[PDB]
Design a protein around this nucleic acid. Structure first.
Ligand SMILES: [Mg+2]
Lengths: 485, 735, 729
RNA sequence: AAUUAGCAGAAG
RNA sequence: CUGCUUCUGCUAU
RNA sequence: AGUAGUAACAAGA
């Protein structure tokens, strides 16, 4: 009966197999090249590569964050004693006067003799946190009669093109700095030789990962989300000034405390897990927003003075922004240190594979090289059209920055893009192995990806990077045609 | 100007080796905000869209608009198709019964032997059950208990016979009742003064009353599913709807899933119910056997596939025929019992969630339009997509807020029987005696096909024939998510085979956090997770030591238990610094008491108090390991309480579930009454928490006989005086 | 406190709701009403833990006089909650109250922790009294196997162990006395002695007893050490690319030492048999072999038992051979006999076909089981004689059962009327004879029926018993209850003083099993006793490392670099009949690539380790042809000549070699004009490439079509998927 | 050669 | 208003 | 405003 019911079935019900060639692969996401779409704006929580840390060399005392912000502002007394705003940029539905009065309220609250960092419910506080903006709930009969109460359409995420700052965030957070920021606790003493091998590998891996900019940004996110959840549960019906802070150790072993700005937690009666608390963030920076003007249409940028980091003199700007978060992003921000692990294992496995080819532990031969082994170099990125090979620790830092930006810009679009582009990565790998892959509906496979590219900066930059790398693979594949023919 | 490309790691590394970078599981999973009426209505519409060419009719039991796609016309295009031909299903089961002789009768004998011993407490092993007496979601034991105490009013006492079979007999004897009577819960909506925008507060105090429903409303409630949306689903862009069956359904689904589990255990070409390294060894053995089975000089292709619309195109009218053909030798009562469940799944009525919310923007108002009152407003007061969906829902929308859902398998409680159907599609292996042969692997809706032939055009003919065959059984292979390469690298249920399965570290990465039960159990859980990922997930020694450090840092920042020599301040760090300065042997302090970490790789399976037992001060060990510490609730008869052995870091956190503006007086008192009765029963019978007590008699009679015998043995052995014995028997005579 | 429970019951029955709950709930529905919960359990425990620690009082106190020791304020910190919230709510406290208890709390006795957590204290003792060895960096082939996680003393099945635990802790409400009470009353009365006056909650004692008694077996990836003393430290033991030697503490059993001794002797003989003078290399490896603490000669000295391999290694070292074998409970000693195992397609009693090992010849054994003796005499698939002594009746029953199964008679196969599992749940290959042995213990009455009966013998001391196990009239066919120096060779054969051999190197079994303890070979090149993929990967690494010397001495010399010590280890995983054929093919292909100037380096690396054994050609002085080169063990283990393989792959563009997964780079050791050279000149022997794809000669010829050609006849050959070439002999 | 629930994580 | 199944892990609230 | 994202929170389950 199966062969009977396969002869009265139409020939239009088929699987339509198609042999996949290299020229069959088009670039994913074409609308990101269209110049009639706006550049994708910066929509992270805190500043990452444009951060400015006011240092204060403390004397071994984790006393209080309010006292820490007070002492670090007492060291920079000129930025604290600014009472005149110099407006550089303004957001669209913003209010520069209320944001400046709230910054002055945060400065006058953090530098008093008191022991509490609470704000009052002024006009500017109730505007910037957002009070009474909930809709009133009425009964269903009155709304059934009311012909004005429609059901509002959802706002689809806007479509955006490749903004050139995401490459800058990748290039700068994957570089070495002079300060550490990781608070790694001690471990038990080593007895087995596995633990000696692990410690002598961990010294190399940590000394590459710890002294980099993404580790400082990661610890800033972790500590701010921890303090934010603490103040959200302890203080729900109060506006609280929370300083953005970090602890840093330079190459000399000297410990500094870096202040990165302040923040105003709104009213945080977070009953559900997707309920929003409004956080008004005031962050220091030294980047002029007039340079890249489309990067910041969400920020209000003042100027509060100058800073002599050396004999050179730089300017200092104050990025003000109304923002929000919920309980789940705070929990996953308290657990961001796992961005080490997903980046460490993926490199350490490679070391272990090399250790099973040569016969000895190849950590030093991979990272720095030794007598009978050249160091491991990985193809790391582009430079004016060509391909550049970088170091092992460079690739370790690039994978760490990738996992950190998976956390930072993570929403449903990054998940959908990741799955539907992994399904295409396996096809390109089957094309590189000379297995001869066959597809059945390639245009729908591409269309499942291209509906996830809306406004996420990491997704748009990842589609741009996919098209770049695919062009390099198509260029590289043109040597196999001379094999046995 | 060097510009970093993170995909260029894939130039030196293959994709399957570096697949852990393609899983963004350090980010936040997507959750659902708001209603779940839109995805439920779209599920109903898309289910009836692939089945609308079949026989539409009206059931004369309920009144719903039933749709029968089975034995319908054949498909004409590559759209999803639900018209499964019956003769092709029975012929595939003929092939699968020829190839494994005696399998069906052995599975039916084992399932019938398992059913004759199973009690009703098996129906307390569920997460959240749709309760029909409140039309809500209750837990499974609460839904079962309300059903039993409600069936006692309608003279259905078959739950006091102990077993499962008289309870299911009571279930199908409830459907032929003229009127049902049960226990409902209503509330008092008390008005209270307050100070906010609206002015007053609405306090909902619930209390339990007695209700009476008619016959057809009971048949509609007992066949109803409760629909919601699934949260934390990684790997998808848009959300989806899921459903929940009542207590009158799971009691029959258990037997059919047990039957299909007995069949699936003995099929070589499945992926259920194996799991873990067992499944990895089985799949590696199967891939090696299908790799050595290639002809000399041929080509073996591998299709990495996925089926689109698995719950939306399968049919319970095919599962009824599968339980009729599998149980072809069992007695007639077992065939009726095994045919009840796909009958109830072919008359299911989906409840449509919470409704839609309509807002007035200029007045700052909003309101919630429920599911019965859904069509009470004009369709111009909706969006575009909601207007289109409400226009498509109107033939099937019943006037009580539910909707008929005859085709499809929305609740999805047949993960093993659909695997049997997929293997029966895999067990055909040829069509028309052409020059190929296929063989595959099938978990519930994920397959992997292997086609050996002479050259790859013949392999493509075999793949086209497998697609056409799967169309005949209701299995639409997704042409967008499937691809086909040569043998050696494929993917099956997110297991990436590249000449052996590779190690994916990033999938089991969200388990590495502090699990959150108490301090001691979280330390044990975290070190065991690091140890097991070191065993079978490729986490090396350096990564595991770094994971020990990161777990200790997150543990200290969660439980506020930093090291006593550090300078961190808090409500706990005051006494932690005091304990650090008091203790002589500070290396024996636990990490929850502000101590040093001594965990490493070689001691991950030893707990925290055992590792630090010979480094402890005796005063700190006596204060920690106190048998009467008030943080661990002992087993006392409600002193003479038992000694709680574990430390003070095994405290309990009572999750005081109290809703806003809900005075939970009476729902606390009934739960307290049940807890008091069970506490006295466990006082009388001590092994009630180790072994399940059997017995078809009353708990008062069992306790009375146990106390009478206990007093009689305590009297004659001198432990009880004659006046105490007279008090005991004079009390027991008045009971 | 029975009277207090009676008074609580009288206080509870005057409340009209609990009265009707008690009077109507059956004891079977206690399990239902115990889990009665109105509110759902919260979704995230980690989010509620991170969110609940940032509150005033997250914990919950137990009301008593020990909770009142905590002060309501300690230096400004409110430890516990205020007592004005007591009424129908409860008392709560902060985590600072826990830390105050751990600092300034009342002291108590820590006797009860050490009793309950005795398993973890033993787990710690087995690691403190344990020495470590050395870590090695190299390939490790892990096999997924069901192993026991933790060591025990009395491994009992969980239903029997639950009945035993009920007979230890709750003996009044224990149920029906089963057979488990009888064979464990020593443990029951001993544990009831040791847990006599204790005040722990009895459910904690139940779970510490089931942690002491019940086994726990899981599917873990093991490689070379599967005992529960080595599985408890499996994370530190080996990885995918390293191996840490470990010598655990506590004590071990002689069964694991005998099993690992059998495995080590088998591996030594299997690696030894390809060498020149295999006896010398066999003794040389068997001297420096340590089974986890001690050499192999001490293990062969002290252990009663072994196999053919243990006896060959015993006689090689100069020890007395112990010709005692086992079939589970049946211990046997070969009086005289000579039998060889071949695979037979046996149909069994319920109608299933299985490849079972069946022996030949005619054999005589001294058999023993429990404390019963006997003498058995059999032939190929037939029991003939069995004279047993007088002992207990069930031990005699088991003895005759094991002699029936051991005889491999046709009746024993034809009596298996039931459900037999010749396979795992994960599709792994169980032993057929041990499965039939475990089946025929309790359900042997069908074997009693299908064996048959006959008369008794009527001699003096020959009386035959029946199924009643008494001296009855009709006995079973072949069963009578009667009341009453070697040498060693070069090829590892055990020849007598006269010349009739008893054991040879052809008689060792090829079940490549995993050892129970850890075997260590203190030798240079101890990787030659590894598995198949380890030997393939190590041999290809050795060819890659020495590629310049091998290439120069091949381009200069002729037959002085087909012989190396690495290829002697590589030959021991090529099967015996095809090794000479693979050698002739690969030697002809390599001589073809040298004599005419087309040279490929991937083919040279690929087909160089097959050029070790002497070439077995055809009957006219010409080699064989092959598509793939199949190696020992599993389905993945083959080397494709034209394609890539699971064990070998080559990327010509990136010049990257893949051996068993690991990627070496050939970029730097290659001829820079080799990508213009064709693969088909290094594909067959005598067949080269002259032209392009020509449909005027036919389709792509197979192996049998090419072996029967003539010099000059051209054919079409498909290298891989996409490249047809022409081929001339 | 063989060996009673609750909660969490992943996959489907 | 967080469904079903499988595997793993911890515990006996 | 804002978080966000096919529907909600921006206090009264
Ligand atoms: Mg799949």
């Amino acid at each position: 009966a199966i062969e009977r019911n396969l002869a009265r079935m139409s020939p239009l019900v088929s699987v339509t197999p198609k042999k996949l060639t290299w020229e069959d692969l088009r670039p994913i996401g074409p609308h990101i090249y269209n110049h009639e779409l706006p550049e994708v704006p910066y929509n992270a929580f805190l500043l990452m590569s444009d951060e400015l840390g006011l240092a204060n060399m403390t004397e071994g005392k984790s006393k209080k964050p309010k006292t820490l912000a007070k002492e670090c502002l007492e060291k920079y007394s000129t930025l604290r004693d600014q009472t005149d705003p110099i407006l550089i940029m303004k957001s669209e539905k913003a209010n520069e006067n209320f944001l400046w009065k709230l910054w002055r309220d945060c400065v006058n609250t953090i530098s008093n003799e008191e022991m509490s960092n609470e704000l009052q419910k002024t006009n500017y506080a109730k505007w910037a946190t957002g009070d009474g903006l909930t809709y009133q709930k009425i009964m269903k009969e009155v709304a059934i009669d009311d012909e004005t109460m429609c059901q509002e359409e959802p706002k689809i995420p806007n479509k955006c093109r490749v903004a050139a700052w995401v490459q800058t965030e990748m290039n700068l957070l994957s570089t070495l700095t002079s300060k550490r920021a990781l608070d790694l606790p001690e471990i038990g003493p080593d007895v087995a030789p596995v633990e000696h091998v692990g410690s002598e590998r961990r010294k190399y891996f940590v000394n590459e990962i710890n002294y980099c900019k993404a580790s400082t940004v990661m610890m800033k996110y972790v500590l701010f989300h921890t303090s934010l959840l603490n103040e959200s549960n302890a203080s729900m019906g109060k506006y609280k000034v929370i300083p953005i802070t970090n602890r840093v150790v330079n190459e000399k072993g000297e410990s500094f405390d870096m202040l990165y700005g302040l923040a105003v937690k709104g009213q945080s009666h977070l009953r559900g897990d997707t309920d929003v608390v409004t956080v008004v963030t005031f962050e220091f920076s030294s980047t002029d927003p007039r340079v890249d003007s489309g990067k910041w249409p969400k920020y209000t940028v003042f100027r509060i003075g100058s800073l002599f980091v050396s004999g050179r003199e730089k300017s200092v700007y104050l990025y003000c922004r109304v923002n929000g978060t919920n309980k789940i992003q705070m929990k996953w921000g308290m657990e961001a240190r796992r961005c080490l692990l997903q980046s460490m294992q993926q490199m350490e496995a490679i070391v272990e594979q090399e250790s099973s080819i040569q016969g000895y532990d190849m950590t030093k031969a991979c990272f720095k090289g030794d007598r009978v082994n050249s160091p491991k170099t990985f193809s790391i990125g582009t430079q004016e059209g060509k391909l550049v090979k970088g170091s092992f620790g460079k690739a370790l830092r690039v994978i760490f920055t990738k996992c950190l930006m998976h956390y930072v810009f993570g929403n449903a679009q990054l998940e959908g893009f990741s799955a539907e582009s992994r399904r295409l990565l396996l096809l390109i790998q089957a094309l590189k192995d000379r297995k001869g892959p066959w597809v059945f509906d390639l245009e729908g496979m591409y269309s499942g990806i291209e509906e996830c590219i809306s406004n996420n900066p990491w997704v748009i930059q990842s589609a741009y990077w996919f098209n770049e790398w695919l062009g390099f693979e198509k260029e590289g594949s043109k040597v196999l045609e001379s094999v046995d023919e | 100007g060097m510009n970093i490309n993170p995909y260029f790691l894939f130039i030196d590394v293959p994709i399957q080796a570096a697949i852990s970078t393609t899983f963004p599981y350090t980010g936040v999973p997507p959750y659902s905000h708001g209603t779940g009426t839109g995805y439920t209505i779209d599920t109903v519409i898309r289910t009836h869209e692939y089945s609308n060419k079949g026989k539409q009719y009206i059931s004369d039991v309920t009144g719903c608009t039933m749709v029968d796609p089975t034995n319908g016309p054949l498909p004409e295009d590559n759209e999803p198709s639900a018209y499964a031909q019956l003769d092709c299903v029975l012929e595939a089961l003929d092939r699968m019964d020829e190839e494994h002789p005696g399998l069906f009768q052995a599975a039916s004998q084992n399932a019938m032997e398992t059913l004759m011993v199973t009690t009703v407490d098996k129906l307390t092993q569920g997460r959240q059950t749709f309760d029909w007496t409140v039309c809500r979601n209750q837990p499974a034991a609460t839904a079962l208990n309300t059903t039993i105490t409600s069936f006692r009013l309608n003279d259905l006492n078959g739950a006091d016979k102990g077993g499962l079979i008289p309870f299911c007999q009571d279930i199908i004897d409830s459907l032929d009742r003229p009127e049902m009577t049960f226990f409902s819960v209503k509330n008092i909506k008390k008005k209270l003064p307050a100070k906010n925008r609206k002015g007053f507060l609405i306090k909902r105090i619930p209390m339990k009353v007695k209700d009476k429903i008619t016959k057809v409303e009971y048949i509609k409630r007992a066949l109803s599913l409760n629909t919601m949306t699934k949260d934390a689903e990684r790997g998808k862009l848009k959300r989806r709807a899921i459903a929940t069956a009542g207590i009158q359904i799971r009691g029959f689904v258990l037997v059919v899933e047990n039957l299909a589990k007995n069949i699936c255990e003995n099929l070589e070409q499945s992926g259920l119910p194996v799991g873990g390294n067992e499944k990895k060894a089985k799949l590696s053995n199967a891939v090696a056997k299908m790799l050595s089975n290639c002809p000399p000089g041929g080509i073996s292709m591998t299709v990495t596939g996925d089926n689109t619309k698995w719950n939306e195109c399968l049919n319970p009218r095919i599962f009824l025929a599968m339980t009729e053909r599998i149980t072809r030798d069992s007695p007639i009562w077992f065939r009726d019992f095994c045919s009840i469940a796909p009958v109830l799944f072919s008359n299911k009525i989906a409840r449509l969630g919470k409704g839609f919310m309509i807002t007035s923007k200029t007045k700052r108002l909003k309101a919630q339009i429920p599911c019965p009152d859904l069509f009470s407003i004009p369709l111009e007061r909706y969006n575009e997509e909601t207007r289109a969906k409400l226009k498509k829902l109107k033939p099937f929308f019943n006037e009580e807020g539910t909707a008929s859902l005859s085709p499809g398998m929305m609740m999805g409680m047949f993960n093993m029987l659909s695997t049997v159907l997929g293997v029966a599609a895999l067990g055909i292996k040829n069509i028309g005696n052409k020059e190929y042969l296929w063989d595959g692997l099938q978990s519930s809706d994920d397959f992997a096909l292997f086609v050996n032939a002479k050259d790859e055009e013949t392999c493509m003919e075999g793949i086209n024939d497998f697609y056409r065959t799967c169309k005949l059984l209701g299995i639409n292979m997704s042409k967008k998510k499937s691809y086909c390469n040569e043998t050696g690298m494929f993917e099956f249920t997110s297991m990436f085979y590249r000449d052996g399965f590779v190690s994916n570290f990033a999938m089991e990465l969200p388990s590495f956090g502090v699990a959150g039960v108490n301090e001691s159990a979280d330390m044990a859980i975290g070190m065991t997770i690091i140890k097991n990922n070191m065993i079978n997930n490729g986490m090396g020694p350096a990564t595991a030591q770094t994971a020990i450090q990161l777990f200790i840092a997150d543990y200290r920042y969660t439980y506020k238990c930093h090291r006593g020599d550090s300078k961190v301040e808090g409500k706990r760090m005051k006494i932690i610094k005091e304990l650090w300065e008091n203790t002589k042997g500070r290396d024996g302090l636990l990490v929850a008491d502000g101590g040093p970490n001594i965990y490493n790789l070689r001691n991950l399976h030893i707990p925290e108090i055992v590792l630090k037992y010979n480094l402890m001060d005796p005063e700190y060990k006596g204060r920690l390991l106190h048998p009467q510490n008030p943080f661990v609730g002992h087993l006392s008869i409600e002193k003479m309480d038992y000694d709680a052995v574990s430390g003070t870091h095994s405290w309990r956190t009572k999750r005081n579930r109290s809703i806003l503006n809900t005075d939970q007086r009476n729902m606390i008192l009934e739960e307290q009454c049940y807890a008091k009765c069970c506490n006295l029963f466990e006082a009388c019978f001590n092994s009630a928490s180790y072994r399940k007590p059997v017995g078809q008699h009353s708990m008062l009679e069992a306790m009375a006989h146990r106390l009478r015998m206990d007093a009689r043995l305590d009297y004659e052995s001198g432990r009880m005086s004659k006046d105490d014995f007279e008090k005991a028997m004079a009390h027991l005579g008045e009971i | 406190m029975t009277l207090a429970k009676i008074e609580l019951l009288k206080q509870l029955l005057r409340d009209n709701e609990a009265k009707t709950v008690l009077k109507q709930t059956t004891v079977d529905q206690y399990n239902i009403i115990r889990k009665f919960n109105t509110s759902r359990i919260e979704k995230n425990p980690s989010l509620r833990m991170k969110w609940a620690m940032c509150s005033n009082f997250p914990l919950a106190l137990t009301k008593g006089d020990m909770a009142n020791r905590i002060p309501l304020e300690y230096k400004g910190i409110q430890l516990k909650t205020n007592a004005e919230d007591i009424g129908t709510k409860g008392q709560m406290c902060s985590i600072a109250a826990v830390t105050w208890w751990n600092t300034y709390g009342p002291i108590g006795d820590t006797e009860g922790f050490e009793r309950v957590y005795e398993s973890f204290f033993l787990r710690k003792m087995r690691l403190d009294n344990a020495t470590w060895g050395r870590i090695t960096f190299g390939p490790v082939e892990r096999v997924r196997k069901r192993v026991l996680l933790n060591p025990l003393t009395k491994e009992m099945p969980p239903d029997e162990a639950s009945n035993v635990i009920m007979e230890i802790l709750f003996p009044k409400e224990a149920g029906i006395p089963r057979e488990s009470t009888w064979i464990h009353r020593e443990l029951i009365k001993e544990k009831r002695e040791k847990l006599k006056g204790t005040m722990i909650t009895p459910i904690v004692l139940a779970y510490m007893l089931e942690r002491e008694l019940v086994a726990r077996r899981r599917f873990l990836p093991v490689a070379g050490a599967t005992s529960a003393e080595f599985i408890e430290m499996l994370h530190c033991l080996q990885g995918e690319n390293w191996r840490q030697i470990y010598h655990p503490g506590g004590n071990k059993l002689t069964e694991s030492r005998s099993q690992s001794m059998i495995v080590a002797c088998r591996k030594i003989i299997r690696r030894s048999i390809v060498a020149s003078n295999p006896l010398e290399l066999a003794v040389e490896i068997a001297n420096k072999t340590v089974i986890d603490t001690e050499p192999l000669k001490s293990c062969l000295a002290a252990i009663d038992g072994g196999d053919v391999a243990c006896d060959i290694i015993r006689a090689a070292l100069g020890l007395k051979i112990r010709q005692r074998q086992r079939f589970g409970r049946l211990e046997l000693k070969r009086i005289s006999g000579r039998g060889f195992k071949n695979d037979e397609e046996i149909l069994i009693g319920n109608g299933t076909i299985q490849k079972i090992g069946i022996w030949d010849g005619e054999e005589e054994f001294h058999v023993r089981c429990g404390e019963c003796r006997g003498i058995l005499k059999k032939s190929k698939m037939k029991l003939e004689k069995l004279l047993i002594n007088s002992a207990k009746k069930e031990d005699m029953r088991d003895l005759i059962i094991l002699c029936m199964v051991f005889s491999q008679d046709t009746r024993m196969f034809q009596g298996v009327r039931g459900e037999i599992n010749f396979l795992n749940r994960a599709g792994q290959l169980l032993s057929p004879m041990y499965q039939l042995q475990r089946y025929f213990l309790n359900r042997s009455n069908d074997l009693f029926d299908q064996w048959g009966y006959e008369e008794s013998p009527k001699a003096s001391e020959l009386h035959g018993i029946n199924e009643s196990m008494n001296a009855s009239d009709y006995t079973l066919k072949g069963v009578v209850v009667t009341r009453n120096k070697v040498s060693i060779t070069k090829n590892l054969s055990l020849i007598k003083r006269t010349g009739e051999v008893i054991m040879g190197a052809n008689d060792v079994s090829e079940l490549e099993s995993q050892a129970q303890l850890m075997i260590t070979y203190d030798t240079p090149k101890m990787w030659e006793m590894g598995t198949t993929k380890e030997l393939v990967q190590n041999t290809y690494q050795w060819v890659l490392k020495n590629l310049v010397t091998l290439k120069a001495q091949f381009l200069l010399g002729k037959e002085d670099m087909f012989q190396w010590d690495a290829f002697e280890a590589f030959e021991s995983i090529i099967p015996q009949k095809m090794a000479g054929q693979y050698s002739g093919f690969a030697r002809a292909v390599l001589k073809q690539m040298r004599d005419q100037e087309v040279m490929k380096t991937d083919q040279f690396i690929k087909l160089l380790p097959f050029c070790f054994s002497p070439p077995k050609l055809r009957s006219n002085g010409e080699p064989y042809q092959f598509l793939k080169l199949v190696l020992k063990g599993g389905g993945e283990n083959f080397i494709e000549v034209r394609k890539g393989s699971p064990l070998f792959s080559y990327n010509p563009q990136t010049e990257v070699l893949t051996i068993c997964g690991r990627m070496m780079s050939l970029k730097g050791k290659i001829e820079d004009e080799e990508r213009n050279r064709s693969m088909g000149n290094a594909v067959l022997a005598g067949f080269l490439v002259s032209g392009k794809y020509d449909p005027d000669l036919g389709d792509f010829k197979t192996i049998e079509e090419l072996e029967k050609l003539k010099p000059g006849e051209k054919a079409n050959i498909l290298l891989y998927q996409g490249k047809p070439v022409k081929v001339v002999k």
